[PDB]
Amino acid sequence: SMLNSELNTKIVNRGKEFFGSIEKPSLFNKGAWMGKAMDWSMQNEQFKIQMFRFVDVFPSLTTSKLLTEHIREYFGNEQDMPAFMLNKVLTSNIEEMARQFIVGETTKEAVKNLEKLRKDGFAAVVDVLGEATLSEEEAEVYTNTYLELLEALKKEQGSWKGLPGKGGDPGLDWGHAPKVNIAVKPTWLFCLANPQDFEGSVVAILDRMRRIFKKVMELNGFLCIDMESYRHKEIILEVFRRLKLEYRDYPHLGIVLQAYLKDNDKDLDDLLAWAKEHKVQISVRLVKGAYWDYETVKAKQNDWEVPVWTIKAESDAAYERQARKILENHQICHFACASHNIRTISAVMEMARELNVPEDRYEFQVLYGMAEPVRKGILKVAGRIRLYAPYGNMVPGMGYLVRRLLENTANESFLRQSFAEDAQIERLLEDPAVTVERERAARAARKGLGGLPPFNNEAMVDFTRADHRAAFPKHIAQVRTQLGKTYPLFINGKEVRTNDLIPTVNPNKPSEVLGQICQAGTTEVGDAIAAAKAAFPAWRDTDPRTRAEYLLKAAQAARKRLFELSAWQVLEIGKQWDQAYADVTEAIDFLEYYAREMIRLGQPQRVGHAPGELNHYFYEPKGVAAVIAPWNFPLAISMGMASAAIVTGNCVVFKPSGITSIIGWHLVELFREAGLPEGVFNFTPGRGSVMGDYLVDHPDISLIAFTGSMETGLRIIERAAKVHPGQANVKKIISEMGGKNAIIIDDDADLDEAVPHVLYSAFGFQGQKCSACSRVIVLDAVYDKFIERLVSMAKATKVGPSEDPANYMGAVADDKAMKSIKEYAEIGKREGHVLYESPVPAGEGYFVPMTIIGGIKPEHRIAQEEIFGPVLAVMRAKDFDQAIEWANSTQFALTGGIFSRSPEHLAKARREFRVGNLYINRNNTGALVERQPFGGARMSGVGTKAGGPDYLLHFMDPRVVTENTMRRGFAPIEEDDDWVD
């Protein structure tokens, strides 16, 4: 509009006067060493990656040997290094870089330097550096540091003259602002902060934030609650709202809001409306946001909507739009403009003039140590400028430095464009709404096959959503209205009841009987095999695209029942909410992936190129498949094995585990809803002592798909090898048989990541995963530090019923598992030494303590035998060679992990740590279809990888038809013929 253009002219002219008054920030001073290192990082993305990852690992390089080797592995030798580049050249320069952005390493030093900044005319908001909070003790250390800082500031602020203002209180900064202002990171107050336990996380954080806030109010100071990643945004908003209402008359409490979030337009509207409704005032520090790359990656990894804008100008436009909304509401909402962008700052200054906002309702904030000319200009133009000033230990100071280097050298950074790229000032001061429309239009100007979308994994449950948080209590309650049923066999499209019933109960409350399961005798199993055999010829002759359609229909049937199917798993086998939902989404992924794989593999392909001849290569099913499924992934692996057999043209006789037979019945419901032909899927739970060998030995079985224990799998393999009278085929074995999986913790591991990932790998679903970490192999010189943090984090977690989301893990599968795991725990405590043994609930339930045992060596039984429970063995390796040797010292080879930031050690692990799925710098559990096709060799399996592009072939046999096309000396010319044209 006309008015829009007139204000834009004022902003652009203010930005022009801003640039004209300024000279480069010190980070862009290419005379200094950090300016040279950053200049080459901005020209060479390969070097940027090396340098920034080096600074990240640098604080763990605690010996001369670690440091020298990492320097060579990251940067090469002295020949390949850049001109400005050893153990002294980098160490002093990197440490000097990190000190550029921190106001001190101790509280006393920080307070002295904060006083110096005041005499230069700058206010401050003080922040405490820290490694990630992984325990209650660490949360207390962080909390008590703020309390210590506030006590030091309390004794000094009385002697500080307020920064000069235009009027008001000469004891206050600019006449109105509190002299003491601190910022706190909420998740640093609770190591288990997680919206899966929303109330518990809010309360734990609020209780510590309240203790800090009371001290702040005694000082008449300001507390700002910082905003972190999207995972915790709603938690943090709720902490702010509760604390504000507890002290409704105290004005000096702020919250950060992130303009790069699509949610923020609504979140700001909501918070303003909420403050009006409750008749309180608030303060907002508006930022763009600090986690852009992380949010984009994390959402894409989980098929979630990306919560951030992804055109940089959209964040700039959102900031100016949201800053206007705050300034319009200045009577209720104090404003802190937190940006280094001259356009953004100039826009806020002119909007404040347009809206005639009193100066005591807005101030400007920049980070200590950067954008100095923008900082000096704000001081000279506005006069109210506060530095965000972190202080503390150099180890988290190094991580902070990396984030600042990333911020300043980003391709889209306003600072880089202004002071490194010689950008045109007109384009820099452009209305970002104009930039948005241009970038969108340019963008407006992976494919599937056969009209189907490409494969994508089904979205994980998203507990940032109120509706997802509410769904599990709702659907667990709805499931409890349908208990007590008798589940029959399902054979040839008919329900068949038998007189032999086995109850299935809640492992966390065994007095809760969920239903009764009919058991098949050998007669009923034989009927199921016969029905599968009779259905096989017409199913085999069904078009592969048509067979795949049944799987797609079953996938949509499960997708529509996702929370219901999950709730059943919570009760029948003690899955935690996330674990249950991930089991159902994996089942859906198998269906969607195997449908597409059969479509891909179902068309015959010409092979060879000789003329006068056509050879077509294609696949045939085998016949009847016995599918013997585990309880620990009761829908995922059951549906994967069964649907793979079915879509490739076989018919299935399915034995679910005797303790997850209701989940097994879900397969019946899903295939029935898909309209699958009768006999193609038959459901025969039964007693292995009655019908187990019968099923495996039967001459009409052509394939056995099994996931379970090594002892049972090896026995099945032995028995299936025999060809009985009337047996058409050599029986094909698809077998997955578990593991004894290790994670290696290298000297240079990032323990803030390694500790929580190891804890989840070991104790997620109380360790009942073939992929679970049961050995953590820790390098000698990091052992004591790692186990202290691991044990301290373990002590914060609670063991209890899985329907309660506050519990980390709960009861194991049944009484037999409990007895067997407890025996293994006693064996392990005699082999090594107990480091942690959790409390468990009193009363009923198959509870085994969360157990960590140290001093374990490869000779020990709990270093070799799969326990399948919450028992973690900690092993102390003398060097990295022994760590790999120990990792490889079992009969198994299923999964493994390594936390290391050494290129040489990672290369050695990739080559020699020969598990079927090796994970680098993350947990070794949670494989996804297509991304991590899953399975191993040695005693862990027969080298079949479910969820990958080699799997379906195992359910089939190849066939070739060769035709001589020549008649009377002529043959049709075919497209791919080798000919003479």
Ligand X SMILES: Cc1cc2nc3c(=O)[nH]c(=O)nc-3n(C[C@H](O)[C@H](O)[C@H](O)COP(=O)(O)OP(=O)(O)OC[C@H]3O[C@@H](n4cnc5c(N)ncnc54)[C@H](O)[C@@H]3O)c2cc1C
The binding site comprises 185, 227, 258, 285, 288-290, 292, 310, 312, 339-341, 403-404, 407, 414
CB-wise, 187 or 702, nearer to ligand X?
187
Using CA atoms, how far apart are residues 552 and 543, in angstroms rounded to an integer? 15
- At 438 the three-state DSSP class reads helix
**Are the beta carbons of 391 and 104 closer than 8 angstroms?**
yes
Tokens read off for 314: 């959209």
In the shown chain, the binding pattern of residues 518 to 557 toward its own copies, with x for contact by CB under 8 A and - for none, equals: -----------------------x----------------
Return the one option of its own copies, ligand X, none that residue 197 interacts with (CB less than 5 to 8 A, by type): none
Q: Does 979 bind its own copies (CB under 8 A)?
A: yes
- At 620 the three-state DSSP class reads strand
Other CB atoms closer than 10 Å to residue 83's CB: what's the count? Answer: 6
- Among 350, 736, 803, 866, the active-site one is 736
**Are the beta carbons of 539 and 531 closer than 8 angstroms?**
no
Burial bucket for residue 70 (CB in 10 Å: 0-12, 13-18, 19+): buried
Tokens read off for 696: 């495996």
Tokens read off for 709: 């224990």
CB of 290 to ligand X, least distance (A): 3
CB of 348 to ligand X, least distance (A): 11
Which residues make up the interface to ligand X (CB under 6 A)? Answer: 226-227, 256, 258, 260, 287-292, 308-312, 314-315, 338-341, 344, 365-367, 388, 407, 412-414
Residues at the binding site for FAD are 227, 258, 285, 288-290, 292, 310, 312, 339-341, 407, 414
- At 614 the three-state DSSP class reads strand
CB of 970 to ligand X, least distance (A): 12
CB-wise, 285 or 596, nearer to ligand X?
285
Using CA atoms, how far apart are residues 848 and 59, in angstroms rounded to an integer? 38
- For 375, residues 6+ apart whose C-beta sits below 8 A from its C-beta are 122, 366, 385, 387
Return the one option of its own copies, ligand X, none that residue 446 interacts with (CB less than 5 to 8 A, by type): its own copies
Instruction: Name the one residue in this structure whose structure tokens are 């700002």.
Output: 224
Residues touching its own copies, count (CB under 8 A): 99
Residue 615 φ then ψ, to 5°: -110, 125
Other CB atoms closer than 10 Å to residue 872's CB: what's the count? Answer: 30
CB of 9 to ligand X, least distance (A): 21
Site for its own copies in 275-334 (CB under 8 A): 290-291, 293-294, 296-298, 300-301, 306, 310
CB-wise, 309 or 847, nearer to its own copies?
309
Using CA atoms, how far apart are residues 252 and 154, in angstroms rounded to an integer? 16
Return the one option of its own copies, ligand X, none that residue 294 interacts with (CB less than 5 to 8 A, by type): its own copies
CB-wise, 279 or 967, nearer to ligand X?
967
Site for its own copies in 380-409 (CB under 8 A): 399, 402-403, 406
**Are the beta carbons of 645 and 625 closer than 8 angstroms?**
yes
In the shown chain, the binding pattern of residues 783 to 822 toward its own copies, with x for contact by CB under 8 A and - for none, equals: ----------------------------------------
| Interface pick for its own copies out of 359, 383, 971, 974 (rule CB under 8 A) | 971
Measured CA distances, 248 to 178, 181, 221, 252, 275 (Å): 18, 19, 15, 10, 10
Return the one option of ligand X, its own copies, none that residue 718 interacts with (CB less than 5 to 8 A, by type): its own copies
Return the one option of ligand X, its own copies, none that residue 260 interacts with (CB less than 5 to 8 A, by type): ligand X
Sheet of strand 624-628: strand arrangement: 494-496, 489-491, 681-683, 651-655, 624-628, 701-707, 732-736
Q: Does 608 bind its own copies (CB under 8 A)?
A: yes
Residue type, 847: F
Site for its own copies in 624-653 (CB under 8 A): none
CB-wise, 78 or 859, nearer to its own copies?
859
CB-wise, 366 or 518, nearer to ligand X?
366
Using CA atoms, how far apart are residues 622 and 633, in angstroms rounded to an integer? 26
Q: Does 960 bind its own copies (CB under 8 A)?
A: yes
| Interface pick for its own copies out of 289, 369, 828, 933 (rule CB under 8 A) | 933
Using the rule CB under 8 A, give the single segment among 117-125, 155-163, 490-498, 726-734 that binds its own copies.
726-734
Site for its own copies in 884-913 (CB under 8 A): 891, 901, 906, 910-911
- For 762, residues 6+ apart whose C-beta sits below 8 A from its C-beta are 772, 773, 774, 776, 852, 870, 872
Q: Does 441 bind its own copies (CB under 8 A)?
A: no
DSSP state string for 132-187: ---SHHHHHHHHHHHHHHHHHHHHHHTTPPPPP-SSS-TTSBTTTB-S-EEEE-GG
Other CB atoms closer than 10 Å to residue 156's CB: what's the count? Answer: 14
Return the one option of ligand X, its own copies, none that residue 414 interacts with (CB less than 5 to 8 A, by type): ligand X
Write the DSSP symbol of residue 737.
-
CB of 127 to ligand X, least distance (A): 9
Q: What angle do CA 491, 497, 501 make, to 5 degrees?
A: 120
Site for its own copies in 36-55 (CB under 8 A): 45, 49, 52-53
CB of 862 to ligand X, least distance (A): 44
CB-wise, 258 or 761, nearer to ligand X?
258
CB of 832 to its own copies, least distance (A): 26
CB-wise, 23 or 718, nearer to its own copies?
718
Tokens read off for 514: 């969920």
Return the one option of its own copies, ligand X, none that residue 869 interacts with (CB less than 5 to 8 A, by type): none
CB-wise, 309 or 955, nearer to ligand X?
309
Residues at the binding site for (S)-lactate are 185, 403-404
Q: Does 615 bind its own copies (CB under 8 A)?
A: yes
Return the one option of ligand X, its own copies, none that residue 245 interacts with (CB less than 5 to 8 A, by type): none
CB of 226 to ligand X, least distance (A): 3
Question: Is 651 a residue of the active site?
Answer: no
CB-wise, 168 or 943, nearer to its own copies?
943
Return the one option of ligand X, its own copies, none that residue 622 interacts with (CB less than 5 to 8 A, by type): its own copies
Helix extents (H) in 517-561: 522-540, 544-559
Q: Does 915 bind its own copies (CB under 8 A)?
A: yes
Can you list the positions of beta strands (E) in 244-384?
253-258, 282-287, 333-338, 362-367
Q: Does 601 bind its own copies (CB under 8 A)?
A: no
Residue 447 φ then ψ, to 5°: -90, 155
What does the buried/exposed string (b/e) look like for 180-195 if buried means 16 or more CB atoms within 10 Å of the residue's CB?
bbbbbbbbbbbbbbbb
Pairing of strands 489-491, 494-496: antiparallel
Return the one option of ligand X, its own copies, none that residue 425 interacts with (CB less than 5 to 8 A, by type): none
- Among 770, 773, 803, 866, the active-site one is 770
Catalytic residues: 736, 770
